[PDB]
Amino acid sequence: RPFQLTHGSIEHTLLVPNDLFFNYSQLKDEFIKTLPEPTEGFAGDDEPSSPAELYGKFIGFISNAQFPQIVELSLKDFESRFLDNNNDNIHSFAVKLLDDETYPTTIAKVKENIVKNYYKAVKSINKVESNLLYHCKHDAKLVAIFGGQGNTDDYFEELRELYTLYQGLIEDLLVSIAEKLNQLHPSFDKIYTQGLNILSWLKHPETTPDQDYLLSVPVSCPVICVIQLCHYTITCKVLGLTPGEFRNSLKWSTGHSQGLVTAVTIAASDSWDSFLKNSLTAVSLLLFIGSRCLSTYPRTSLPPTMLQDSLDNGEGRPSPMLSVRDLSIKQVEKFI
Amino acid sequence: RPFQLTHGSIEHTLLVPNDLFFNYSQLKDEFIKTLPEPTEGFAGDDEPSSPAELYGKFIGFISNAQFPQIVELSLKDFESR
Amino acid sequence: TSKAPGTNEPYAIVSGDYNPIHVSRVFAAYAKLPGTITHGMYSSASIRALVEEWAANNVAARVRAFKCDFVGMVLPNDTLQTTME
């Protein structure tokens, strides 16, 4: 008898080619033993909790196992099963999965198990798609903005999950970046002694220095540019867009306090290698900035009465820069 | 290893042709999911409660499923059995 | 709470104290002591800079005398918690 592909309390059974079930079952046997026990509706973070999520976890699993000619087959199957005429919308497919009732909504289990595994298993994404948010090539106007220094407290985790997710998209570039850093890292020792091996901190979380030294300027200044550049590389590659032609789509762009260097890189980026070279000149620049803006005004200790009071007043931990809201310029200049 | 055709608390395992087990198992997989849970000796009206009864329910099941050349084979098997 | 350094060599080259108890495994073993323990003077200056801000509210000229007793030894990278009374 022919029987069903199954798991847990949720199942997504697909039609394999009739002459593949044998070896197809080997991957399944290896897969079923890699999944934890079902938990009261799959509330466990690592077990899938929607049929599409299960199928995605499986497709990520088979991508590492040495058995090709199934990875892409099951991949196009996943497409036709969920992404027809929108077979480049797995992001939107993901955020739509957040709306299911069979699936208890949590974006974390949607990002991984679906998107991570897709681009982990997908072959060349180079299907030049529709810049159709600009499809009114005559009517819309895109402008890219690049964040500046200090928009968030815990920033390195953005790069953490980004590498966790699109590793196959950034691994080619960020290692070339970190190498160039290590070629310039020791030349500016004595100001960031805990090293600048980003690859270590990503491949090994415990090797990552504390957020404070991470929040240090000679540290945070280049990695923000790194985050922006990997984001740009991703949005160029998911669309399969060369950086220079994606730039052709934009009308103009500029950057904040810090990221403005990324903006001027984009305006000089034509190919991927040109992009890589200009990113190198960027992170080398912002590393100099981080070094010198600290060696010029080194942040020192602060009287604990001060910051204790400031945190009891609900204010922030004191820092060289203060943001005031809800007040016009003409009166803040009157208080200063 | 070769293993056994089975269900529930009663089993009627037959000898398939050696070159059919593959697709024969597909019908079984479709069949096992159409049967309710065993009930204290299969007191439920719709679950079979004798090996011949199980085999008959299976043979009715495969007759609708699009896979001939097994229906009559298993049928003459039921006869000889 | 404080933490011992990783290596005592930076302190040694600055303080001019090249005492091989703190820099070389072989001497630290010759004296049968637990290893390249931190420079006692470094451990002093560490707690001194600690109290200089936690007791004097980071006003440097307020401290006028400081004395301490190296009761125990500290191997590098050790995490040290102090009380202040």
From Swiss-Prot, chain B:
Q: Give the domain of life.
A: Eukaryota
Similarity annotation: Belongs to the fungal fatty acid synthetase subunit beta family.
Q: How does it assemble?
A: [Alpha(6)beta(6)] hexamers of two multifunctional subunits (alpha and beta).
Question: What biological function has been recorded for the protein in this entry?
Answer: Fatty acid synthetase catalyzes the formation of long-chain fatty acids from acetyl-CoA, malonyl-CoA and NADPH. The beta subunit contains domains for: [acyl-carrier-protein] acetyltransferase and malonyltransferase, S-acyl fatty acid synthase thioesterase, enoyl-[acyl-carrier-protein] reductase, and 3-hydroxypalmitoyl-[acyl-carrier-protein] dehydratase.
Q: What is this protein called?
A: Fatty acid synthase subunit beta
Give the lineage.
Eukaryota, Fungi, Dikarya, Ascomycota, Saccharomycotina
The gene coding this protein: FAS1
Complete-protein stretch covered:
5 to 85 of 2037
